[PDB]
Design a protein around this ligand. Structure first.
Ligand code: C2F
Lengths: 363, 128
């Protein structure tokens, strides 16, 4: 199992390390519930250095990404603008989800998951080649996500004048290089904040200065409960190569217009949109207990007929005080369902696939 | 602190304190709670339940998993910690105080006579 440049800083901060897809990462630093609370109420931070960052350069970059991705980078028209997108196979299944940042007509950046690094790099280097793209894997960079209502203010105490200038007023989903910091208003928690990428050799010290600025170290435990509350997918659970984005609440990321933009998977998607698909819903279990991954979700239509979906992610929501889940279910599900726990059938409420928005339960 | 002097210990990772009325208060150790992570629910046995040493008779639920808590000794459950319903985090913050799980009237002195002590216990975390 590998480690990040921050391995030491983590143990100094009291991390309980676990093996996470071949990297030793902090599960938590003492209390995941407290870490979750910090992000929701103040400022918390995560070592996200195990994500892969890809720089793409050459006059054909925009053109290439319009083909690679299901959202449409032509939407990015202001310097530094970012969007979220899936990257599909030819059958319309999801290879990965990712964020892409536009810098100049000839310079884009992708940030992809850690578990999917090798498969994505191969897919990307495979399809980029005929476009002649210069593809750079930025393993020389670490990245820290700083998240919470005071995260931006705390992080900015570490910025020099030029960096503060660069980010002042920066709206959500933008990224900017300012000296050796790349600062972007992106995140996976549902709160405002930054992700900051910087050279590996500077990352230990930035983490230390962030701790000292009052940002709480948060591990994978809290990372999961924050993202799930926020309705954000985890590749491998909400979708994978066999699951269409339209079954993973990523329908909204598919840029269908302009219709003359072909992208990998568009044809199969078009067919799936026409044949219809399952859908990703939220589950809320107000009774005692905790929903867990891969549990069956059952409901009975008006006609007396039983139907079954599956939980893709379940957790306890510290912001709701109740167990929540994302689940993939046939269309026509109603307001309630039943989930099998141990060997008893627990009622759940069926909801939109999002639990906490702009700070509060979206109840 | 981590292993109070006056307690008996199981393996299991539970502790027992002899009460003035001869019953035993039982909960999990700081080491057990550290390995559990934040507790979000606990399912307690019924008062008046007879248990045998080794029975799984209570469940702690954390954010990450459910995990069984086993009877350290044979006996009858005389009380359960009803504070854990609203305040399950007491298992984490106060494993030896507010975080106690149940109380047992022990039915077998020889089991009691093989429970670990503050010393034999600190030798078990230290062992591995
Ligand atoms: C761990 N991920 C991630 C990344 N890239 C970065 N930079 N940070 C990340 O945390 N790429 C891979 C995966 C991305 N998964 C996701 C999931 C949701 C959102 C997100 O912000 N969704 C918003 C979208 C709002 C918008 O598009 O403006 C949401 O409200 O659901 C981003 C990345």
């Amino acid at each position: 199992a590998q480690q990040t440049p921050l391995y030491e800083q983590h143990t100094l901060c009291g991390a309980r390390m676990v093996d996470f897809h071949g990297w030793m990462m902090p599960l938590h630093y003492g209390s995941q519930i407290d870490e979750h609370h910090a992000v929701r109420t103040d400022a918390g931070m995560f070592d996200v250095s195990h994500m892969t960052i890809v720089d793409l350069r050459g006059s054909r970059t925009r053109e290439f990404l319009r083909y690679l991705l299901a959202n449409d980078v032509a939407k990015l028209t202001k310097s530094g603008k970012a969007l979220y997108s899936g990257m599909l196979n030819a059958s319309g299944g999801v290879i990965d989800d990712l964020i892409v940042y536009y810098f100049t007509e000839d310079f884009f950046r992708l940030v992809v998951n850690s578990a999917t690094r090798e498969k994505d790099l191969s897919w990307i280097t495979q399809h980029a080649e005929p476009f002649g793209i210069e593809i750079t894997v930025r393993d020389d960079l670490s990245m820290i996500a700083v998240q919470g209502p005071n995260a931006q203010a705390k992080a900015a105490t570490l910025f020099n004048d030029a960096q503060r200038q660069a980010v002042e007023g920066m709206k959500p989903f933008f990224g900017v290089q300012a000296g050796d910091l790349f600062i972007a208003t992106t995140g996976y928690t549902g709160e405002a904040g930054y992700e900051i990428a910087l050279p590996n050799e500077k990352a230990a010290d930035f983490w230390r200065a962030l701790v000292e600025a009052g940002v709480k170290p948060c591990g994978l435990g809290a990372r999961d409960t924050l993202r799930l509350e926020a309705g954000m997918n985890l590749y491998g659970q909400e979708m994978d190569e066999t699951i269409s984005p339209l079954a993973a609440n990523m329908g909204w990321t598919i840029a269908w217009e302009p219709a003359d933009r072909d992208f990998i998977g568009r044809e199969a998607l078009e067919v799936q949109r026409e044949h219809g698909t399952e859908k990703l819903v939220g589950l809320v279990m107000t009774e005692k207990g905790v929903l867990r991954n891969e549990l069956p979700v059952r409901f009975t239509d008006a006609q007396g007929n039983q139907h079954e979906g599956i939980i893709t992610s379940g957790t306890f929501s510290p912001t709701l005080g109740y167990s929540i889940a994302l689940a993939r279910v046939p269309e026509g599900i109603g307001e309630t369902a039943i989930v099998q726990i141990r060997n008893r059938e627990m009622p759940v409420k069926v909801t939109k696939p999002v639990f906490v928005r702009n700070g509060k339960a979206v109840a | 602190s981590n292993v109070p002097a006056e307690l008996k210990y199981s393996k299991e990772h539970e502790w027992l304190r002899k009460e003035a009325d001869g019953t035993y208060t039982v909960g999990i150790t700081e080491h057990a709670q550290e390995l559990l992570g934040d507790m979000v629910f606990v399912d307690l046995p019924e008062v008046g339940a007879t248990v045998s040493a080794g029975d799984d008779c209570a469940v702690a639920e954390s954010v990450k998993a459910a995990s069984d808590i086993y009877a350290p000794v044979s006996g009858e459950i005389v009380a359960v910690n009803d504070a854990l319903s609203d305040s399950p985090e007491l298992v984490n913050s106060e494993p030896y105080a507010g975080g106690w799980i149940f109380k047992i009237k022990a039915s077998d002195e020889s089991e009691l006579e093989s429970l670990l002590d503050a010393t034999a216990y600190e030798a078990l975390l230290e062992d591995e």
